[PDB]
Design an enzyme around this catalytic site. Sequence first.
Site, PDB file in Angstrom:
ATOM      1  N   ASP A  43      29.989  28.503  19.828  1.00  0.00           N
ATOM      2  CA  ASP A  43      29.586  29.502  18.860  1.00  0.00           C
ATOM      3  C   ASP A  43      30.008  30.858  19.356  1.00  0.00           C
ATOM      4  OD1 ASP A  43      27.900  30.081  16.397  1.00  0.00           O
ATOM      5  OD2 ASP A  43      27.304  31.649  17.842  1.00  0.00           O
ATOM      6  N   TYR A  48      30.877  39.991  19.065  1.00  0.00           N
ATOM      7  CA  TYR A  48      30.534  39.775  20.483  1.00  0.00           C
ATOM      8  C   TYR A  48      31.593  40.342  21.419  1.00  0.00           C
ATOM      9  CZ  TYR A  48      27.524  36.234  18.316  1.00  0.00           C
ATOM     10  OH  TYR A  48      26.609  35.571  17.523  1.00  0.00           O
ATOM     11  N   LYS A  76      32.142  34.391  13.262  1.00  0.00           N
ATOM     12  CA  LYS A  76      31.415  35.154  12.281  1.00  0.00           C
ATOM     13  C   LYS A  76      32.200  36.364  11.864  1.00  0.00           C
ATOM     14  CE  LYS A  76      27.297  33.669  14.835  1.00  0.00           C
ATOM     15  NZ  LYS A  76      28.033  33.492  16.192  1.00  0.00           N
ATOM     16  N   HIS A 109      28.181  37.188   9.285  1.00  0.00           N
ATOM     17  CA  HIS A 109      27.416  37.474  10.504  1.00  0.00           C
ATOM     18  C   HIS A 109      26.068  38.104  10.141  1.00  0.00           C
ATOM     19  CE1 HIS A 109      27.923  38.505  15.039  1.00  0.00           C
ATOM     20  NE2 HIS A 109      26.657  38.248  14.749  1.00  0.00           N
TER      21      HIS A 109
HETATM   22  N1  LIG Z   1      24.364  34.972  14.156  1.00  0.00           N
HETATM   23  C1  LIG Z   1      23.890  35.892  14.990  1.00  0.00           C
HETATM   24  O1  LIG Z   1      23.566  37.142  14.533  1.00  0.00           O
HETATM   25  C2  LIG Z   1      23.570  35.651  16.430  1.00  0.00           C
HETATM   26  C3  LIG Z   1      24.018  34.535  17.053  1.00  0.00           C
HETATM   27  N2  LIG Z   1      23.672  34.273  18.354  1.00  0.00           N
HETATM   28  C4  LIG Z   1      24.306  33.121  19.001  1.00  0.00           C
HETATM   29  O2  LIG Z   1      23.344  32.307  19.661  1.00  0.00           O
HETATM   30  C5  LIG Z   1      23.672  32.249  21.026  1.00  0.00           C
HETATM   31  C6  LIG Z   1      22.435  32.037  21.891  1.00  0.00           C
HETATM   32  O3  LIG Z   1      21.497  33.061  21.727  1.00  0.00           O
HETATM   33  P1  LIG Z   1      21.384  34.178  22.839  1.00  0.00           P
HETATM   34  O4  LIG Z   1      20.500  35.258  22.300  1.00  0.00           O
HETATM   35  O5  LIG Z   1      22.756  34.476  23.353  1.00  0.00           O
HETATM   36  O6  LIG Z   1      20.650  33.490  24.078  1.00  0.00           O
HETATM   37  P2  LIG Z   1      19.721  32.199  24.320  1.00  0.00           P
HETATM   38  O7  LIG Z   1      18.458  32.099  23.547  1.00  0.00           O
HETATM   39  O8  LIG Z   1      20.568  31.024  24.412  1.00  0.00           O
HETATM   40  O9  LIG Z   1      19.266  32.640  25.824  1.00  0.00           O
HETATM   41  C7  LIG Z   1      20.178  33.319  26.651  1.00  0.00           C
HETATM   42  C8  LIG Z   1      19.457  33.910  27.869  1.00  0.00           C
HETATM   43  O10 LIG Z   1      18.764  32.947  28.617  1.00  0.00           O
HETATM   44  C9  LIG Z   1      19.407  32.705  29.855  1.00  0.00           C
HETATM   45  N3  LIG Z   1      19.493  31.257  30.067  1.00  0.00           N
HETATM   46  C10 LIG Z   1      20.495  30.415  29.655  1.00  0.00           C
HETATM   47  N4  LIG Z   1      20.176  29.171  30.036  1.00  0.00           N
HETATM   48  C11 LIG Z   1      19.011  29.203  30.682  1.00  0.00           C
HETATM   49  C12 LIG Z   1      18.258  28.194  31.288  1.00  0.00           C
HETATM   50  N5  LIG Z   1      18.424  26.918  30.955  1.00  0.00           N
HETATM   51  N6  LIG Z   1      17.085  28.546  31.907  1.00  0.00           N
HETATM   52  C13 LIG Z   1      16.662  29.859  31.930  1.00  0.00           C
HETATM   53  N7  LIG Z   1      17.428  30.856  31.318  1.00  0.00           N
HETATM   54  C14 LIG Z   1      18.574  30.512  30.697  1.00  0.00           C
HETATM   55  C15 LIG Z   1      20.769  33.373  29.750  1.00  0.00           C
HETATM   56  O11 LIG Z   1      21.122  33.877  30.987  1.00  0.00           O
HETATM   57  P3  LIG Z   1      22.450  33.429  31.789  1.00  0.00           P
HETATM   58  O12 LIG Z   1      23.654  33.659  30.933  1.00  0.00           O
HETATM   59  O13 LIG Z   1      22.443  34.271  33.033  1.00  0.00           O
HETATM   60  O14 LIG Z   1      22.361  31.955  32.144  1.00  0.00           O
HETATM   61  C16 LIG Z   1      20.434  34.526  28.837  1.00  0.00           C
HETATM   62  O15 LIG Z   1      19.667  35.533  29.473  1.00  0.00           O
HETATM   63  C17 LIG Z   1      24.441  33.532  21.282  1.00  0.00           C
HETATM   64  O16 LIG Z   1      25.190  33.498  22.460  1.00  0.00           O
HETATM   65  C18 LIG Z   1      25.300  33.592  20.049  1.00  0.00           C
HETATM   66  O17 LIG Z   1      26.280  32.599  20.151  1.00  0.00           O
HETATM   67  C19 LIG Z   1      22.887  35.143  19.052  1.00  0.00           C
HETATM   68  C20 LIG Z   1      22.391  36.313  18.514  1.00  0.00           C
HETATM   69  C21 LIG Z   1      22.697  36.687  17.096  1.00  0.00           C
END
Ligand SMILES: NC(=O)C1=CN([C@@H]2O[C@H](COP(=O)(O)OP(=O)(O)OC[C@H]3O[C@@H](n4cnc5c(N)ncnc54)[C@H](OP(=O)(O)O)[C@@H]3O)[C@@H](O)[C@H]2O)C=CC1
Length: 308
Positions: A43, A48, A76, A109
């Site tokens: 995704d 981004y 998006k 988006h």
């Molecule tokens: N359509 C839209 O407007 C949007 C879409 N999205 C999409 O959804 C995706 C996911 O949502 P997003 O808000 O990025 O983040 P998530 O809810 O997936 O959480 C990400 C955070 O949690 C940490 N993390 C990842 N894995 C773990 C783990 N298993 N245990 C503990 N912490 C963890 C990551 O840190 P680290 O990287 O250091 O591991 C980061 O800080 C986005 O990347 C994007 O692709 C997001 C926002 C808006």
Amino acid sequence: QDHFVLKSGHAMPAVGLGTWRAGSDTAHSVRTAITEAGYRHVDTAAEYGVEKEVGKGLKAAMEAGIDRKDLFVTSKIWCTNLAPERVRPALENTLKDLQLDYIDLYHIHWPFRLKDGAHMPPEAGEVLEFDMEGVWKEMENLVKDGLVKDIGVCNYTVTKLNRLLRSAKIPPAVCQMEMHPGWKNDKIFEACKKHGIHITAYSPLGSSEKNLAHDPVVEKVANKLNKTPGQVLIKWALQRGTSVIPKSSKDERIKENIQVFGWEIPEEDFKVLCSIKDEKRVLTGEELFVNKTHGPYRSARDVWDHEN
Ligand SMILES: NC(=O)C1=CN([C@@H]2O[C@H](COP(=O)(O)OP(=O)(O)OC[C@H]3O[C@@H](n4cnc5c(N)ncnc54)[C@H](OP(=O)(O)O)[C@@H]3O)[C@@H](O)[C@H]2O)C=CC1
């Protein structure tokens, strides 16, 4: 299930790699995810600012022998391009960045047009009318022209969805929304369900901002099931019947985050998770769309058609 079947008949893997704020390791992360961790869904999005690097990840993944046909790439279209004439060039740009001939899902988006050069937070006159019908029509032409396999919307409301459904020749395949314990948005889910629209849970961990991996309720379930908090959070989504796009830039957590098959969350714990009050919302759109002084959106409530 490890996949969903969209109304078009195309399969979408249940778990995908989120790439927002993926950073410098973006391309490595995408490659690891696909080859080492077995992800078949990435995704991403123009805004981004990582699609180039994601295209490099996908490139090395396909050079490793993963067929294009087995990958599901979402991108998006950004608000600035939510004008009929700008739909196609935006997609074409995205495809160039991603080094793909087509992507599997192209989302609106956010359902708000932004002026070129718009600021965060928006200035007077920078948030423009979204011609949803006209923009969606060109989104449909993307599918007609084989550039996109399915089209979808993010950050919708029931109101906006009904509007879209009255017009769309091709209904959105997928509605992607922030969902996680503490922000279930069952309202949108039930409207998508009613209309046979598949739902992707974004920010399934609570993003970084309201990350739930250290939440005691999540930790409690995780300890009993001997899964990591992140796994429990990702599993919760799957058990709700959404796909889910956890983001990590850490190889270990990329691998962790897809070890969500061959077990379940007991319904008692699922219910505790669901009972966390909806109020942990990470993405309100405020800093993107809300000018309280001049409008058109004075508050997040305005962004979400006062549905939540
Ligand atoms: N359509 C839209 O407007 C949007 C879409 N999205 C999409 O959804 C995706 C996911 O949502 P997003 O808000 O990025 O983040 P998530 O809810 O997936 O959480 C990400 C955070 O949690 C940490 N993390 C990842 N894995 C773990 C783990 N298993 N245990 C503990 N912490 C963890 C990551 O840190 P680290 O990287 O250091 O591991 C980061 O800080 C986005 O990347 C994007 O692709 C997001 C926002 C808006």
